[PDB]
Amino acid sequence: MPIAKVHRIATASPDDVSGLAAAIATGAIAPAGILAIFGKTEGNGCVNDFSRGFAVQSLQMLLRGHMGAAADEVCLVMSGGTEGGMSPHFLVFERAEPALAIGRAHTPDLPFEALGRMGQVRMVAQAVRRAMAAAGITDPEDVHFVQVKCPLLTAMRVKEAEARGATTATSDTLKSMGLSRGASALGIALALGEVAEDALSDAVICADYGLWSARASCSSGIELLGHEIVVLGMSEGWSGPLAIAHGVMADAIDVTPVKAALSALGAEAGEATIVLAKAEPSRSGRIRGKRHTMLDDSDISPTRHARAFVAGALAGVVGHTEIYVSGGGEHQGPDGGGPVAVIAART
Amino acid sequence: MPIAKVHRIATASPDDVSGLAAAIATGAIAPAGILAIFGKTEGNGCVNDFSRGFAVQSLQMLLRGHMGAAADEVCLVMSGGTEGGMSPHFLVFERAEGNAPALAIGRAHTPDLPFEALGRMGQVRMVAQAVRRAMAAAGITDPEDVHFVQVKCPLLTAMRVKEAEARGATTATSDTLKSMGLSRGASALGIALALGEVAEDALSDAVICADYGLWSARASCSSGIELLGHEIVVLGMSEGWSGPLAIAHGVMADAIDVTPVKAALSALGAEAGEATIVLAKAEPSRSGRIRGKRHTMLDDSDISPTRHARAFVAGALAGVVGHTEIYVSGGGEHQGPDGGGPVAVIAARTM
Amino acid sequence: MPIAKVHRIATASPDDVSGLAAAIATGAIAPAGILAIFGKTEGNGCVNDFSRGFAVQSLQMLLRGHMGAAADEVCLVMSGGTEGGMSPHFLVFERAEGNAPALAIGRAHTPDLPFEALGRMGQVRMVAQAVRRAMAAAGITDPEDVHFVQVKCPLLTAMRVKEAEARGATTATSDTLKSMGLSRGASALGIALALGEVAEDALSDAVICADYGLWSARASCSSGIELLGHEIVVLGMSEGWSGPLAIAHGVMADAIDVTPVKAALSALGAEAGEATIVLAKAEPSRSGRIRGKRHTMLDDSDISPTRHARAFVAGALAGVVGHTEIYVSGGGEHQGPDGGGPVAVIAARTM
Amino acid sequence: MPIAKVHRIATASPDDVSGLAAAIATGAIAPAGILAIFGKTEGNGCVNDFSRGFAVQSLQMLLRGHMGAAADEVCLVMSGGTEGGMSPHFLVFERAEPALAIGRAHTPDLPFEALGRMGQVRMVAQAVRRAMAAAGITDPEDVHFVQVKCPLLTAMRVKEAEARGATTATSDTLKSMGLSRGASALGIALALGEVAEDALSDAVICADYGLWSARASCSSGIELLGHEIVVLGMSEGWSGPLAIAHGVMADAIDVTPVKAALSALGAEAGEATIVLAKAEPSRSGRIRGKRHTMLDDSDISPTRHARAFVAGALAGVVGHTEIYVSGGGEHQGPDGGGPVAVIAART
Ligand SMILES: O=C1CC(=O)NC(=O)N1
Ligand SMILES: O=C1CC(=O)NC(=O)N1
Ligand SMILES: O=C1CC(=O)NC(=O)N1
Ligand SMILES: O=C1CC(=O)NC(=O)N1
Ligand SMILES: O=C1CC(=O)NC(=O)N1
Ligand SMILES: O=C1CC(=O)NC(=O)N1
Ligand SMILES: [Mg+2]
Ligand SMILES: [Mg+2]
Ligand SMILES: [Mg+2]
Ligand SMILES: [Mg+2]
Ligand SMILES: [Mg+2]
Ligand SMILES: [Mg+2]
């Protein structure tokens, strides 16, 4: 009889762990039961975003203090970029004593020449199986959202790779984020059976954006070399007030999937609603026939636009700004769209 | 009896006037009756945004071709900044002649604005006078029949500040991005003053962009490097106009308050669709919070605050109205409450 | 016997042609003899830079006024991006008639470039042919007498890529900022091919923006959203020209290699001063290092790499030549070694 | 007979302390003798720059490891913004057993309503006296460079201030950096006798840019609430190979002061040369008559331009890119200019 408990904690700063410390001090959260922490941090959400790594170090110090080496098994998904009115926050996932289930998993360092290729797809497919097992889930149809934290390439990482005779899938550092999210997304797809294995090859990745998962949510970062996996789903072997529902946004302003999730969860939009969504600029250069400018803008990187825009669209529906919106939906939902999940209690 | 005709035209480029050319060529739009053109252009919407001036020049060239010197009387409001999915377009406002109350349109211009008047009572009075003129031209005497007042106002660059100081004057600021806020703010109070939403002996230099408790529910101001004076366009309802188009408006309490638009669409007897026309002001709240939750728009040295506000509010409204060809403008100094802004809708009745 | 006249004109705005107007009005510049105009405009110098197109339109309007349809034969190279202290200006190249070897100028144009040719041998051959034509027009047959070849080339936007795919074609990229590099690169190889710095059977699609060991010491390419073809301007020395102006050039080994300019000024018998004219390419090095030390230009999602390179190299050169009215252009694909770029100086002899 | 030793350490990352660890491991640097560390970090060098605070935490952990609570007396000046080719690095100042002298000092937290006012000017003037004493310097004419790390204001910090009835000198967060650097600069000026005390008042600060120090170098940051002071100068009571010279750059491309410093130091430009310089966009909007665009640019903040530009100008002279250039020279050198210092050995 395990219990899922999800806690949304405000932050004033990437290094501001004061509020999580407080939930531990008041015994609202028990350090021993922390599975994973998601975050929105104030960085640019792209390559040179050190708010991500900054938060990670700060969370590491605090969690090790309370659980020493067992902190290292906690999944830290720090997703940068809080544009528009999107409010920075931590999402703490704690395990307690059918309802919401949580499973986690890790991977070894990822060879720079494996990134964006079938190497990454595999190595991630496995972790998703392990973590969805640890969640106590056997039916893929009972999975609702799979978060992945993946690596990326810098110019210096690229030249290091070439120095030992290897080639990387790109030398463009920002493209390398897309490849990593995409390859990871297909790995998630593979493990949930949304894609056939012989449908995949290096040439397919970030090319056939017709292959996609309705549940992949992948976030790239400069601060890790392997992967973090967190599976959220519904299970018979879990109990508690919290359930999760999900849907696919067809484009950047498609908010009906969220209204549908709330219905399924039997909850109404309010400050209490937890929202996880992927935002992506559509590669057509259009939304519902109308041209957009995100792919042609040299000042503000495309994912910064997408986040700002869908965060606004979603906040207009759910009524508050503490929502988790993540940019770049390579093979995560249809092109121009992305998965969205809601976590609420029944009324 | 005159008819308002409002035309939304796509553009691929700030200088793409091809769709306006075609509308004129097919007689969909008669150049003689063009009162004003609004635009969202692909620039950054701040100080060094030349997509605005580029569109103006392009529009001026086309219109001089058809109207000659009368082209100069057309109000050109080019508001830059199309962040998020917001889609670049022109809004052409035409007056035509036809046979209940309908959309009315009035325009007015002003002389150049002395750099030392910007952000001060000089600007306020100048715009106020112009707004009264445009009101009259719309055939509107009751301010409650005014629904939206668009103003294009100037700003300060380093060069302009030093020009002013060179002749013994001071400007209200030397921060060029701040000058855009002051200029929008002074213009907004001018609109307020003209509509009677604010009392004249309540206003002074010291109040402007200081007492954000003074605001208009109808002001919409957009600053730009490309003009030295103001363009004023008043939109309202009038008994002396007819046609299918009406206008409704409301005030967003904050950046995610989408209820004013749904209420506006009800008043108009219309439902959200590709055809809905939306004009809205988006503003980062100076409290640094939205509904208790902190935001980072005022603290970001990479992306200028209005750039955030626009992308964010455009997304909220687009989510409601179902398309991205909407006019959203950043910085709501004295335009609605702090953190909010006016929103207006223009639709035809279907119920 | 023809004379090169080079005029450096300040601008307050991309659309500020006032100084060029005055130079024409005072007969300092005769419109008939205007061969090309270079510009540094206040845009970001990347994909969505409309200061370039804005200056072009403005220049086209003024020149059509004086020359009519012959205006269209003037090469307009507007290079955006004036970071750091770099000062926005126009460089007007005029041919005049006078009575040793001196500055020679040649221009040439090309037809529109098929989107599926950009970054591929199509573009390379197109530019190569044009550079040969401009060479001839300059009255230059010896390539060693060519000192600098400026090329304005197109780029790809999302819309253009989807247009190409719609008719069964592929483009060499879908990354619009990458398309600028490919276009500069293909053009540079075209210049190289035309000057014999590279062999034709060394070139192929697979080489372009891949083998940065193939490069020209004289190529200078600038990409822009505002044209579909190319503008070519060849600068060199010729026996068949006379006048005070000569040109010298060199290759910066990296971003802080200022020795080529000092050597160039020696060759020209001139010393650094307000009058020195400088044209240079700046490029972030793909090794990610300068002289062993890492740089962050390739890793920055806020500021695009060429934006860095320009500001940085402009500072180095400005520190040498003593003023900030210099023409610095970013992205040196096949223009000099990786991390370097050509620099040319134009001066009159005083020793 | 104290010895000044200055060590320039490369970094791949704001949190990359591997190279400083190595100098400690090889005994090239002794943790006990570390006085202050200067840094160039990859952030935007402005308000939301977390690479600064990120480095600080990383340096804190490493230094506390070796010297515990005595690490806290080490001055950490992390200056963000590495535009152009400027290469991120640490400058470690260690004390060993007339030549280069080093003195340090601290200040308490700074009240948000004191920032940019005579409060800050004073509180900093004192620390500069204390630190220049600890350096063993009595003649102000023997001081060559005074580094200050100062605080700034965020929107949330502003509303916190107003909540208790106080007003701040600004509500513009980026302006608050200028006020803090300026007020600190005048404080340094005050202590070196470059300015008279009754010449100062709130109204003068960041207004009369005719009052300035030839030695102030002030750097603002979101990650501290008080001030860090480091004085560098020439002393009889110090010995060793290292000397320091300084000069004032009249504008952004005035490189002759550095050639002059090298002459005084009897060294020639080379990879070995250490450079400290302040860069500022001139408020005239011109450099030597020619208009510039730094004050009118809404995409890239003015100090980001200035750094890129003078870093390039200086690197062209000194031949390498590992130089410390800091943006914004309010009362630090003339308007449009800034102090520059060089540290070399005699040949
Ligand atoms: O939203 C996102 C997507 C990503 O890949 N990396 C981030 O830091 N944030
Ligand atoms: O409002 C203002 C006026 C000024 O001069 N400087 C500023 O920073 N803000
Ligand atoms: O949204 C806006 C507000 C403004 O003042 N100027 C613009 O160009 N766009
Ligand atoms: O060079 C290229 C071609 C492409 O399609 N996508 C990329 O990211 N880079
Ligand atoms: O510096 C440059 C290089 C380019 O390709 N295009 C520009 O507009 N400026
Ligand atoms: O160069 C600088 C000046 C400053 O105030 N703050 C920084 O982080 N860097
Ligand atoms: Mg998708
Ligand atoms: Mg349309
Ligand atoms: Mg408002
Ligand atoms: Mg001049
Ligand atoms: Mg090169
Ligand atoms: Mg100064």
Residue numbers in the entry:
A (entry chain B), D (entry chain B): 1 to 97, 105 to 354
B (entry chain A), C (entry chain A): 1 to 99, 104 to 355
From the paper:
The first step of cyanuric acid metabolism is catalyzed by cyanuric acid hydrolase (CAH) and results in s-triazine ring opening to produce unstable carboxybiuret, which undergoes rapid, spontaneous decarboxylation to yield biuret. AtzD and CAH are 51% identical in a pairwise amino acid sequence alignment and share an overall unique fold consisting of three structurally analogous domains that form a barrel structure.
The crystal structure determination of a selenomethionine substituted CAH-inhibitor complex was accomplished using the single wavelength anomalous diffraction (SAD) phasing. The final 2.7 Å resolution model revealed a protein fold consisting of a β-barrel-like core with α helices organized on the outside, forming a central cavity ∼10 Å wide at its opening. In the CAH-barbituric acid complex crystal, the asymmetric unit contains a dimer related by a non-crystallographic two-fold axis that further dimerizes via a crystallographic two-fold axis to form a tetramer with 222 point symmetry. In addition, another barbituric acid molecule, albeit at lower occupancy, was observed on the surface of one of the CAH subunits near the opening of the potential substrate channel, which is discussed later in more detail. A highly organized, trimeric conglomeration of serines, lysines, and arginines surrounds the bound barbituric acid, mirroring the three-fold symmetrical shape of the substrate. Three serine residues (Ser79, Ser226, Ser333) lie in close proximity to the carbonyl carbons of barbituric acid, suggesting that one could act as the nucleophile in a nucleophilic attack on the substrate. The combination of distance and BD angles data indicate that Ser226 is the most likely nucleophile of the three serines in the CAH active site.
